[PDB]
Amino acid sequence: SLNVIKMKSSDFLEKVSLAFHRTQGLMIMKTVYKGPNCIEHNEALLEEAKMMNRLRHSRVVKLLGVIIEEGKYSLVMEYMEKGNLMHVLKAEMSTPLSVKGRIILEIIEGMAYLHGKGVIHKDLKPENILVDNDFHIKIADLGLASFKMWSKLNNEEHNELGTLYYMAPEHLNDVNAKPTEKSDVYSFAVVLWAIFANKEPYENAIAEQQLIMAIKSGNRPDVDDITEYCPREIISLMKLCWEANPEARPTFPGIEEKFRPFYLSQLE
Amino acid sequence: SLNVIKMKSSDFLESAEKVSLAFHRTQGLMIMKTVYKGPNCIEHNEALLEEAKMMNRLRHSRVVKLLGVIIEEGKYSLVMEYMEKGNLMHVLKAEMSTPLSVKGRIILEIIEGMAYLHGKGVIHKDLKPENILVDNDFHIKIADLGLASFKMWSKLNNGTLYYMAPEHLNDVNAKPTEKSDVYSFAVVLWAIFANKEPYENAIAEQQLIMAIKSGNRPDVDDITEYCPREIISLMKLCWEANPEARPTFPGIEEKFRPFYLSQLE
Ligand SMILES: CC(C)(C)C(=O)N1C[C@@H]2C[C@H]1c1ccccc1O2
Ligand SMILES: CC(C)(C)C(=O)N1C[C@@H]2C[C@H]1c1ccccc1O2
């Protein structure tokens, strides 16, 4: 029941790709490695897929299974029709405030679950917030930031196969700094901004070193760039969550206790 | 935040009605369940505080939050959040009939809440409509008002068998499981659509007890309003005699959530 479903390539009728399972239906296959086989790390890879399978929550992307074969390594996850959050925000159909409120709440719920399971995301951004046809979201880890062996497998010498806007300032120009829960909270602040801006931040930045050094100095996404009606409470929340000092930023349970009654009274 | 807030009676401005409504000076409207009042007796306080610490761990939108605890000379109280519309049965028996879309959401919220508690190693043991509180916007939270999970407060404090699984009827020594709560959820499912307590409110006599043990269940034909086929199958599945036949709440949620979205809302 709770075990990892080991899948085979032969289960699929027919590198992130859409894939149809013979009984079970339409799925998404992220093929991590294709090349010469090495069975030495298969035990560790499978154990990481077991860890992936344990993280079950309505706002977290479920691993439906894993293909571990001679030379091919793939993760199989559920289909999300509308794609990532930024694709939805940049679309010609404008997403209403009530849905945006629910999205934010769902992101908080999902991040609160993961932190409760001892999982720091390290790489929360609109690209990792997938959206289904009914505008409900699920948090993903598409670049395998939380999963060392699959991440090493992806960047392997024989394998025949990022955005700094949401990264907390403590991690900009500092590879040694160990990510915390508050690292993801910073990212959530900029995602909050993006949701109401309907765009990526820092458009007026001319160079990368300019931007990096500006963010480290205290510079943040422009609140005056928000053309839509964003509430005062949400502007306070993002301002709180993007504080320079990580101790000043709240926890996701902290965010949820404030935001949920606001969503109920105002947004829905 | 994160630790049990030891509160004082002096933090409350008044306490209008032992469950009573109470206003905190800095934190607004709350509910005070005063468990014991009278002569003070230490040698439970260490254990009582530790149990209140266990209560404090359980944070979830569909679970009643313990906002704090009063442990004073003679007075012992649990302080929890206010749910305006009262328990689920009060809402179901009200003159305004609750629509199917809200009932679907209630069921989903009950599942979410129960799934959280099982995930935290907490068997309820006493799930029923009296322990399902309802806010002004018809969202629910699961409660443990009889203190079934908290032995010392329950002993400090000191009868519906309609939601109790047959394995517990006439076997008080039997250790509860997750499937015990799933049985209870089945009868709650029945109650939600029946709009009443099951078995014609008959006294929980040996005839009834032994009938339930033998296979007897709440009458599905007593549901006069429209209940979907899926929900009738679910309650029938969840009240199976054999606990191994009954699903898990995660099992229920995986099937029920898409059903709620397509059909019920
Ligand atoms: C399959 C894939 C790696 C893409 C994923 O997104 N997840 C697997 C589990 C659950 C979900 C997930 C999200 C975020 C962090 C870890 C994590 O781990
Ligand atoms: C305060 C009171 C005892 C009435 C309660 O309902 N709960 C405290 C925690 C959270 C919530 C709760 C619900 C169900 C089981 C345990 C439990 O424990």
Swiss-Prot record, chain B:
Q: What is the effect of changing residue 52 to V?
A: In a colorectal adenocarcinoma sample; somatic mutation
Phosphoserine-modified residues are 1, 15, 149, 154
Relate the outcome reported for changing residue 191 to V.
Answer: In a colorectal adenocarcinoma sample; somatic mutation
Record localization: Cytoplasm; Cell membrane
Q: Where do the Protein kinase domain residues begin and end?
A: 12-260
Q: How is it modified after translation?
A: (Microbial infection) Proteolytically cleaved by S.flexneri OspD3 within the RIP homotypic interaction motif (RHIM), leading to its degradation and inhibition of necroptosis.
The active site annotation covers: 126
What positions does the entry give for ATP binding? 33
Its subunit composition reads: Homodimer. Interacts (via RIP homotypic interaction motif) with RIPK3 (via RIP homotypic interaction motif); this interaction induces RIPK1 phosphorylation and formation of a RIPK1-RIPK3 necroptosis-inducing complex. Upon TNF-induced necrosis, the RIPK1-RIPK3 dimer further interacts with PGAM5 and MLKL; the formation of this complex leads to PGAM5 phosphorylation and increase in PGAM5 phosphatase activity. Interacts (via the death domain) with TNFRSF6 (via the death domain) and TRADD (via the death domain). Is recruited by TRADD to TNFRSF1A in a TNF-dependent process. (Microbial infection) Interacts with mumps virus protein SH; this interaction inhibits downstream NF-kappa-B pathway activation.
Associated condition reads:
Immunodeficiency 57 with autoinflammation: An autosomal recessive primary immunodeficiency characterized by lymphopenia and recurrent viral, bacterial, and fungal infections. Patients exhibit early-onset inflammatory bowel disease involving the upper and lower gastrointestinal tract, and develop progressive polyarthritis. Autoinflammation with episodic fever and lymphadenopathy: An autosomal dominant immunologic disorder characterized by early onset of recurrent episodes of unexplained fever, lymphadenopathy, hepatosplenomegaly, and increased levels of inflammatory cytokines and chemokines in patient serum.
Would you identify the family this protein belongs to, as annotated? Belongs to the protein kinase superfamily. TKL Ser/Thr protein kinase family.
Free-text comment on this protein's domains from its UniProt entry: The RIP homotypic interaction motif (RHIM) mediates interaction with the RHIM motif of RIPK1. Both motifs form a hetero-amyloid serpentine fold, stabilized by hydrophobic packing and featuring an unusual Cys-Ser ladder of alternating Ser (from RIPK1) and Cys (from RIPK3).
Function recorded in the entry: Serine-threonine kinase which is a key regulator of TNF-mediated apoptosis, necroptosis and inflammatory pathways. Exhibits kinase activity-dependent functions that regulate cell death and kinase-independent scaffold functions regulating inflammatory signaling and cell survival. Has kinase-independent scaffold functions: upon binding of TNF to TNFR1, RIPK1 is recruited to the TNF-R1 signaling complex (TNF-RSC also known as complex I) where it acts as a scaffold protein promoting cell survival, in part, by activating the canonical NF-kappa-B pathway.
Q: State what protein this is by name.
A: Receptor-interacting serine/threonine-protein kinase 1
In the UniProt record, the gene name given for this protein reads RIPK1
Q: Which residues of the full protein are shown?
A: 6 to 294 of 671
